[PDB]
Amino acid sequence: KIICLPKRVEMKGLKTDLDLQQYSFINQMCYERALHWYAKYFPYLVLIHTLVFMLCSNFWFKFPGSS
């Protein structure tokens, strides 16, 4: 999950007077925009590569003509 806050602005509190809905919207927006595509797809990426390696290992015996 991505947590987002506005960047540019005795130290007191720094309330942003924004509701929860706006926070969730901002999280979704910046998650789609800023986060790297590979950074998000890495689990599926590794899964697909491992599955393809397994398939190309098993097709040696899974092809009936040579099986």
Binding site: F25, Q28, M29, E32
Partner: protein
């Protein structure tokens, strides 16, 4: 007036693209079989080897 967004869209789009590729291969497969169905006239078979 409202600006909105739903989470899966971009991911879905990517997914859909890959999905289309699969279907494409599927169609190609049928074509070959169809050609194999419509080039050899499998209704009559003569051994001519045995």
């Amino acid at each position: 007036n409202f600006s909105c967004n739903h989470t899966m869209a971009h991911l879905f789009s990517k997914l859909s693209f890959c999905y289309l590729c699969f279907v494409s291969i599927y169609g190609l497969t049928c074509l070959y079989t169809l050609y194999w169905l419509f080039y050899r006239s499998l209704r009559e078979y003569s051994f001519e080897y045995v």
